[PDB]
Amino acid sequence: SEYDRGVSTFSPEGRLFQVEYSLEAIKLGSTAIGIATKEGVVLGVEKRATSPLLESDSIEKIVEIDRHIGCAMSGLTADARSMIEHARTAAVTHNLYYDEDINVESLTQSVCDLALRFGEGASGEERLMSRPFGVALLIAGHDADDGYQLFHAEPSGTFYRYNAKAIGSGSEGAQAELLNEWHSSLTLKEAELLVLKILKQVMEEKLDENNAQLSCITKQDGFKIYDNEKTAELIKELKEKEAAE
Amino acid sequence: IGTGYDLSNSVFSPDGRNFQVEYAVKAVENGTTSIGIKCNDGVVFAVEKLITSKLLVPQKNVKIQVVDRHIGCVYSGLIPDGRHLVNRGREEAASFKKLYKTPIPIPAFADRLGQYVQAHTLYNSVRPFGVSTIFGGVDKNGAHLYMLEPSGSYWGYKGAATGKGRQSAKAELEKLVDHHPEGLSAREAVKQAAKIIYLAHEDNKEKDFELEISWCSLSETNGLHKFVKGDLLQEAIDFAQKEIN
Amino acid sequence: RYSFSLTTFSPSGKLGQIDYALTAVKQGVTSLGIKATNGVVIATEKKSSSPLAMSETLSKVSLLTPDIGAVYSGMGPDYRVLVDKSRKVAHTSYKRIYGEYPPTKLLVSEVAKIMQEATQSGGVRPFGVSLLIAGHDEFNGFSLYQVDPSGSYFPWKATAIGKGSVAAKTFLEKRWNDELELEDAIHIALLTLKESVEGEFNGDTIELAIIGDENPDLLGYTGIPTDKGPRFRKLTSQEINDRLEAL
Amino acid sequence: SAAGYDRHITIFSPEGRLYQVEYAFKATNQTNINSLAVRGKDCTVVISQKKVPDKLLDPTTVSYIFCISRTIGMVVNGPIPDARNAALRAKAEAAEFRYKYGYDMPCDVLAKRMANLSQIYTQRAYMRPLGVILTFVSVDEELGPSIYKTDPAGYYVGYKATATGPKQQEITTNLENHFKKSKIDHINEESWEKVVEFAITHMIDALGTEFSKNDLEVGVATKDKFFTLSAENIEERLVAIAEQ
Amino acid sequence: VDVLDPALLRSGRLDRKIEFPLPSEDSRAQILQIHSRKMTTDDDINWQELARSTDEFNGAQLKAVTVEAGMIALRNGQSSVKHEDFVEGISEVQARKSKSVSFYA
Amino acid sequence: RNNYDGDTVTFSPTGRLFQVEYALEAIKQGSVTVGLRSNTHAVLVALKRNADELSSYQKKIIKCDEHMGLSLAGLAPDARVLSNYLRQQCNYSSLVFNRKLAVERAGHLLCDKAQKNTQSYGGRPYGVGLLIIGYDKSGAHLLEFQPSGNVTELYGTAIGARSQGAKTYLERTLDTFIKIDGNPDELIKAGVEAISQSLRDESLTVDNLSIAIVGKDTPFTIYDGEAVAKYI
Amino acid sequence: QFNPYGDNGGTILGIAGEDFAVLAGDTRNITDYSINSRYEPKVFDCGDNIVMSANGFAADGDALVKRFKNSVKWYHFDHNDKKLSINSAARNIQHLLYGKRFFPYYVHTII
Amino acid sequence: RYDSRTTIFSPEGRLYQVEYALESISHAGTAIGIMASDGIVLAAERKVTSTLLEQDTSTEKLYKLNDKIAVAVAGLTADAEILINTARIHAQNYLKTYNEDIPVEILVRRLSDIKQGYTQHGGLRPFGVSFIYAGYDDRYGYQLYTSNPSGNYTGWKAISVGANTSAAQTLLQMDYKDDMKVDDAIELALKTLSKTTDSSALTYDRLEFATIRKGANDGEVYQKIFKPQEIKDILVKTGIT
C-alpha cells in the first residue's frame, strides 16, 4: 500500500510484504509436482515451449545436487542459479567433513539460511543479498535414518515437510487432486503415472515428452534423470489407463 | 509542531529545536516513576515497578542495575532502551579500570555517558535514546547523584525524578530538602524514598507495584553498591504505608 | 526536480548545485585582481558587523605559499578549511617533488581539483567560495587565475568577483592597460574598490597585497643569494594610507 | 521558505545560504543565558549567568564555563549536548597540540582548529553543525589577553570584548559606548580583581537586573593559568561593588 | 476548527476553547464495558488486553467493535460471547484482513 | 499518525515506534504456545501448524542446550536466527567458564541482541516472541521475550493467537501448580488443560503437540508423537 | 626464547575387537623428572559411544579434546539429532587437526 | 520520474540521465576534428570571451594526452579535468609497461569504459564530456574517434561535437572529399566555424588549433598545438579577417 517498498519495514499486519510477494513469483513459473512414495520420490516438471526453437531438453528444471539429494525448481531461473549453487556446495562439503550423505532436512536448512539474507546489514549473519530470492524448490532425497523425505524450500526461509507438494501455476489444482490421491500403499511406477495424470490437467498445452521431464530418487539407481524415450513410454501407459475407465 | 523536521534526528527545525529529540522525552513520560535522593553520606534509589499481570514472580524483575561495583543506575522510559545505556556504561567503567587502575569518579562517569547520548543524536541512521538514567553513588569526593535526560543533557541533583508520577515526586522531594538542611541522613532517606514513591503511585492507580530500593553509602555499605533487602526493605514499606493514611 | 541532487542533470544540461553555489559567491565581499607586467595586485575589503571585533584576526588575504597569495568572495567558513587543504596538498604533490613551492599554474590545478571532489560525491556539498589566486613563477611570469566552486579554473588578466563585480568589471575594462607599473596598478585597485563603498573607506579596513619582485627583508636568512625571498608581500594599513592620500 | 533543504546542509538554497546552518544561530538562545567577556591589560574575565530554577539542582554542577586545558577557558551559549561534545573536542585538541608541537596551545590556534571542525560538520551530511557559540578566553604566551568567539558555522573572529545570548544586543551597545568614550581598546585596570568588578557592574547595567552570588559563574584567565571561582570567592567581588 | 470562521474566535467574543483528544488507554477500557452490558457479558474477557491492542481508535470505533463481537458470536451460534470473539472483532471493523495465512501462519 | 511508521530510527509525537508495535502484532498472528513452570520443572506445550493435510508439520521447539530451549510464536525466519545466536552463548559459557549458562543472564543478552537492530538503520525488530525455559542452579525460570527486547520472569504466561484463554486458566490455578513438584507428569497435564481453552474450532492431535521439558535431573528433551499421546 | 610446545609423556593404546573396542591409557602425566599427577583421565567419553584419547603434550591435547566435545553438540543441533559414526568422527578430527597447520597440534590421537 | 537515479531505466528503455548528460555537450563551444589522409586537424571554438579574459597565452581545449594522441574538449570543464588526467595516465602507463606508445583504439576504449562506469555503477553523475580523439598509431594509420558521454565510440573521417552539432556536420560533409589535403582541411574547419558560431568577429581570441601529422618530418609523428599568432596568420589566408 504505502508500507511495502522496503524489506525492513512493516506493515500494520506485521508481515514483511517483500517476502510475501516472492510467493507470487513461484506461480508465474511452470508447474512442478513431487510425490514421495516409500520406494522413492518422483520429481516431475512441466516445460513450456515459447517457440518450437527453444530446445526443450537443454533447459534444465531438474538438476542434480548430489548423488542422493535432487531438486526441482520453479520461478525465476536468474534466482535459481545462485540458489542451487549454494546447495550443491552444501552436499559436497558435508561429504568432505563427515563422509555421510547429507541429510535432506539439514540440506534444506542450508538453502533457507541463505534465503534469510534480505537486509543490507544485520546483527548475526551479515546480510549481503539485496532482496529475497524469487525461486522455490522441491527438495527430494533419501537419507539412511529417516528414509525418503520430500521437502519444499521456500524463498521466505521456511521449510515444510510434505507427502506431496506442487508449486508453479498449476499448484492449486494439483494440490486439490493430490488431496484425494495420496496413499501409504503407493509404489514408484504408480507414482510416476500419478504425476502425469495430475500434470496433463494443469498444463495449458498437451502432454508430450518434449514438455515433461520426470526423474526419481531410488536408493538403488541413485538420482536418475530420464530421457524422452523413457518419458514417452510412460505417457503411452497413462493414456492406456485412462482408456479402460 | 509543524510537518517535517521530525523524521531524522539531525534536522533542525525553524524553531531552533530538534523535534525528534523532544519526542523522546515524551516517550520517557510514559515510563514508571524513578527517583534518586542524594545524602551527605549516601545515595538512595527507589523505583516503582508495576506488576501488570499477577502471574509475575515477585521481586525478580527490576530496573535497578549496578555498574562497576560502586555506582547504582536506574532508568525510566522504555525498558530495553534503558538496559543498552547502562550496558555501554559497564564497558566504559570496565575500560577505565585497566587504563587508570581506579574506580570511576562519578563525574567522570557522567561525562562519558553524556557523550553517548550526544552521538545518537548526531547522525541520520542512529536513533535518539528514549530514556532518562538517574545514576550516581558515592566515591572519593562524597556522594554525587546525576540525571541524564534523553536530550543528552545532565546535571547534578539533590533530588531527581523522572516517570509518570514525576510531578508529585518533585513536590515531596523539595520538602525533604527544606526540613533537612544537612540533606537528610542516608538511613532515614530510605524510609523517605519509599513514601515519596507511594504517593506517586496514586497517579497510576489501576496496577499493583513492587517496591525495590537500593543504595550506596559510605557509612553503611563501605562505599559499595548493594540492594536493600529483607527486614530493612520491610521497614521502608511499613513506614510508607503509615504516613500515606 | 533537477536542482537537488548533484547527480540529476536538467533537461537543458548543467547541474544545480554548481549554479546555486555560484549564487552564494556573489553574495560575498568585493574582491578584485589586475595583472601587471611586473606584478599582480589582489585586493578586498573587510567587515565584521560590530566594531568590537578586531580586524587583523580575520585574514581574507592569505599567502598560500611564499610566492602565491589568494583571496576570496563567498562564505567565510569554507575559505579557512580550503586554504588548509591547499597548503597541505601543496607540500604533498610538489614540495617533495621539487623540494620547494610549486609554480602558480600547477597549484591552480590542485586547488581546482579539491573543488572537483566536493561536487563528485553526493551528500558532500561544493565549497561556498570562489578564489582568485595570484602568484609568480620563473617560466610563465606573473599570473592571475579564478578558481570556481565548479572545479573549473579560468586564466584572467583582470577580473573581479563578489557583490560589486558587475560594476567593478566595467570600470576595470575601461581603465586597464597592457603595460602598467606595480605602483600604478595599486592606484587602479584602491580606486576600483572605492566604487563599492564610500565614507567608511580607509586603509584600516581595506586589505590589499601584492605579488611583486623579491624582498630580501622577509627572507629571514642572508648569505645564500641563489634563492629568492617572498614574492608575496602584505601591505599594512599605514602604507595603504600613503597610496590613498597620494590619490 | 521550504521544500528540500531545510532538511539538508549539503544542499544549497536559491539564496546561496544553507537554511539549516542558519537554524543553529536560532538554537543559541535555547537556555536563555548571556555572556560578557572583556580584556584587561594582563587578564581576561568572562562571566555567564547561572539559572537554578529549582532548589533540587546543585549550583555547583550548573555551569557553562569550562576548563578546557591549563591556560584555556570557554563559555558556551546554547544547549548542553553540543556544549559537552565541543568542550571534549577542545580538551582533546589542546592536549594533542602539545605532544606534536611542544608548548601550550594559543587561544587563536584552538579557536581556529574548532572553527575548521565546525565547517567540516556542515561539509558532510552525516554530521550536522553544532548548536553552540563558543567564546574561548586565554592570556597568550606572546600576544597576552585574547577573546576569540567561534560560532557554530565555522566563523571565528577576535574581540576586544564580546557578548552572546538573547539579550546580547543590549550588552553590545553598552560596550560600544564605553570603549568609544575612553578612546582605547582595553580596560586600563592592572589587577584581575578590579577588572572582575568592572565586568559585574556592566552586566548589571545592560540587562538592568541585580544578580546574586548564586546566579553568576565567573572564570578568570591570568597569564599561565585559568580558574573558576566558587560562589564564596564571587561574593568578595560583589560586596566590593555593593558599597564601594 | 480550521474550517470554522476566524471572527467568531477572534477576541473575547467567545471564550474558552475545549479540545477532546482521542480516548486514552484508561478511557478505552471503560467504553467497551458499558456497551457490552447491553449484550451478553462474560468475565473471561480481559478488557485491558483489548485497550492496549487498539491504536488510534475512537469511541465510535470501539462501539462498532462491541457490536461486531456480537455478530461473530451469533454467526458461529455460541449463545455466550467469548474474549476470542472480541479479539476477532478488532480486525473486521478495521479494513484489514488478519484472516490471511502467511509464510509462518 | 501514521506517517512516522516508515522506519525504526524515527519516533512519533506521543513517542512510540510503530515498527516495534507491529513486530508485536505479528506474534499474535502466528502460532500459539503456552509456557508454565514449577520449582522443580519447566514445561512449554505448543501447537504446531501445517499448511494442509499433506503437510506433516513444522516444529516450534528448538533445543538450545541440555539445559535450555525455547518455543516460538510469530515469524519462523526471525526465530531461526535468534535461536542460533542463543546456542552460541550456551556453548560459550560451557567452553570458557565451565558453567551451565543462567536463564537470568541469558535473556538479558537476548535483549541486547534485540536492541541492536531497533536503534540502527537496517535490520528490523525481530518478528517473534519467544518463551525461553531452563533449569539451572537457581531452579526453573520461564522468560517472555518481546520485540522491544523486554524479558519478563513468570510462573506461567502465554503468547500468540487467541492465547488469553490459557492466561485466564493459568491465573485461576496459579498457586495450584506451583505446589505440584517432583512430578513432571502433572505439569504436562496442566499445560495441556491451559492450551485447550485457547483453541477453539480445532482440538488437539498427536502431531499438533510438542511438549518440551527440562526439570531437576532430566536434560532438555523435545517430545513428539507417541510421547505426547499420554496427554492427548 | 619461547618454546610453544614441550611434552607430557604417557601411553595410550586402542585395540579394535569385532563388536567391543577398547581405548586404554595411563593416568600418569609427567613433566621432565616430576610426576605431576597419579590420576588424571586422558581417555574421555564424548558420547555417541565414542571415546577419544589425545596424548603427548598436555596443552595441545586437552585443548583438542575439548574443541571436538563442542562439535558433537553442534552436530545434534544442526542435523536434528543424528548420531555420529566412528568413521565420520575420524574425518571430523582430520579437519580439526589440519585446521592449524602452521602451528599444529602436536599430540597423537586415537579414537 | 526516471530522472531520480542513473541506475534505473524507463518504461521505453531510455534513461533520462543519459539523454540529459548528452544535451550538456551542446551547451559548450564547437569542437571539430576533420581527418584527412595527410593529417588530422583539431580545431575548437571557445565558449567564453571578454577583453580582460586572458586567452591569448593559453589552451584549455587542446590537450596532449601523450605524444601521439590528443583530444579536443567539449562539455563541462570540471568533468573534463579528471578524465583528461586519467586518460593521460593510462596512455602513458602502456608506455612504461610495453615500452611502445599506446594504440589509438585501445586508449579511447579504456576511457569510454570509465565513462560508462559512472552510469552503470554507484549513485554518481555520469560524466558529461565528449572528447574528440585524434591519434596516429601504425596499425591503421590516422584514426579519428569521438566518444559519447554515454560511453561508446565510433570512428570517423570527420565529426563535430560541442555546440551546433547538427549544423556543423552538414557543412563539413558538403565540401569534404575523400582524396582531400591537410591544408584544405584547415581551411574547411575555418569555413564551418564562421557559420556555426554566434560571434560574427571570429578572430584569433576565440580559436584553438592543433594539427597532427606524420607528413610533418618523415618517419616521425608531430603533434603541434599552434600558438596564438599562427592562428591569426591563417585567418587572413582563408579571408575571414
Curated annotation (Swiss-Prot), chain A:
<dbReference type="Pfam" id="PF10584">
    <property type="entry name" value="Proteasome_A_N"/>
</dbReference>
<dbReference type="InterPro" id="IPR033812">
    <property type="entry name" value="Proteasome_alpha_type_5"/>
</dbReference>
<dbReference type="Pfam" id="PF00227">
    <property type="entry name" value="Proteasome"/>
</dbReference>
<keyword id="KW-0597">Phosphoprotein</keyword>
<dbReference type="GO" id="GO:0010499">
    <property type="term" value="P:proteasomal ubiquitin-independent protein catabolic process"/>
</dbReference>
<keyword id="KW-0539">Nucleus</keyword>
<comment type="subunit">
    <text>The 26S proteasome consists of a 20S proteasome core and two 19S regulatory subunits. The 20S proteasome core is composed of 28 subunits that are arranged in four stacked rings, resulting in a barrel-shaped structure. The two end rings are each formed by seven alpha subunits, and the two central rings are each formed by seven beta subunits. The catalytic chamber with the active sites is on the inside of the barrel.</text>
</comment>
<dbReference type="InterPro" id="IPR029055">
    <property type="entry name" value="Ntn_hydrolases_N"/>
</dbReference>
<comment type="similarity">
    <text>Belongs to the peptidase T1A family.</text>
</comment>
<protein>
    <recommendedName>
        <fullName>Proteasome subunit alpha type-5</fullName>
    </recommendedName>
</protein>
<feature type="modified residue" description="Phosphoserine">
    <location>
        <position position="51"/>
    </location>
</feature>
<dbReference type="GO" id="GO:0034515">
    <property type="term" value="C:proteasome storage granule"/>
</dbReference>
From Swiss-Prot, chain B:
<dbReference type="GO" id="GO:0000502">
    <property type="term" value="C:proteasome complex"/>
</dbReference>
<dbReference type="GO" id="GO:0019773">
    <property type="term" value="C:proteasome core complex, alpha-subunit complex"/>
</dbReference>
<dbReference type="GO" id="GO:0003729">
    <property type="term" value="F:mRNA binding"/>
</dbReference>
<dbReference type="GO" id="GO:0034515">
    <property type="term" value="C:proteasome storage granule"/>
</dbReference>
<dbReference type="InterPro" id="IPR023332">
    <property type="entry name" value="Proteasome_alpha-type"/>
</dbReference>
<keyword id="KW-0647">Proteasome</keyword>
<dbReference type="InterPro" id="IPR001353">
    <property type="entry name" value="Proteasome_sua/b"/>
</dbReference>
<comment type="similarity">
    <text>Belongs to the peptidase T1A family.</text>
</comment>
<dbReference type="GO" id="GO:0005634">
    <property type="term" value="C:nucleus"/>
</dbReference>
<keyword id="KW-0539">Nucleus</keyword>
<comment type="function">
    <text>The proteasome degrades poly-ubiquitinated proteins in the cytoplasm and in the nucleus. It is essential for the regulated turnover of proteins and for the removal of misfolded proteins. The proteasome is a multicatalytic proteinase complex that is characterized by its ability to cleave peptides with Arg, Phe, Tyr, Leu, and Glu adjacent to the leaving group at neutral or slightly basic pH. It has an ATP-dependent proteolytic activity.</text>
</comment>
<keyword id="KW-0007">Acetylation</keyword>
Curated annotation (Swiss-Prot), chain D:
<feature type="cross-link" description="Glycyl lysine isopeptide (Lys-Gly) (interchain with G-Cter in ubiquitin)">
    <location>
        <position position="225"/>
    </location>
</feature>
<keyword id="KW-0539">Nucleus</keyword>
<dbReference type="Pfam" id="PF00227">
    <property type="entry name" value="Proteasome"/>
</dbReference>
<dbReference type="GO" id="GO:0000502">
    <property type="term" value="C:proteasome complex"/>
</dbReference>
<dbReference type="InterPro" id="IPR034642">
    <property type="entry name" value="Proteasome_subunit_alpha6"/>
</dbReference>
<dbReference type="InterPro" id="IPR000426">
    <property type="entry name" value="Proteasome_asu_N"/>
</dbReference>
<dbReference type="Pfam" id="PF10584">
    <property type="entry name" value="Proteasome_A_N"/>
</dbReference>
<feature type="modified residue" description="Phosphoserine">
    <location>
        <position position="230"/>
    </location>
</feature>
<keyword id="KW-0963">Cytoplasm</keyword>
<dbReference type="InterPro" id="IPR029055">
    <property type="entry name" value="Ntn_hydrolases_N"/>
</dbReference>
<keyword id="KW-0007">Acetylation</keyword>
<dbReference type="GO" id="GO:0019773">
    <property type="term" value="C:proteasome core complex, alpha-subunit complex"/>
</dbReference>
UniProtKB/Swiss-Prot annotation, chain E:
<comment type="similarity">
    <text>Belongs to the AAA ATPase family.</text>
</comment>
<comment type="function">
    <text>The 26S proteasome is involved in the ATP-dependent degradation of ubiquitinated proteins. The regulatory (or ATPase) complex confers ATP dependency and substrate specificity to the 26S complex.</text>
</comment>
<protein>
    <recommendedName>
        <fullName>26S proteasome regulatory subunit 6A</fullName>
    </recommendedName>
</protein>
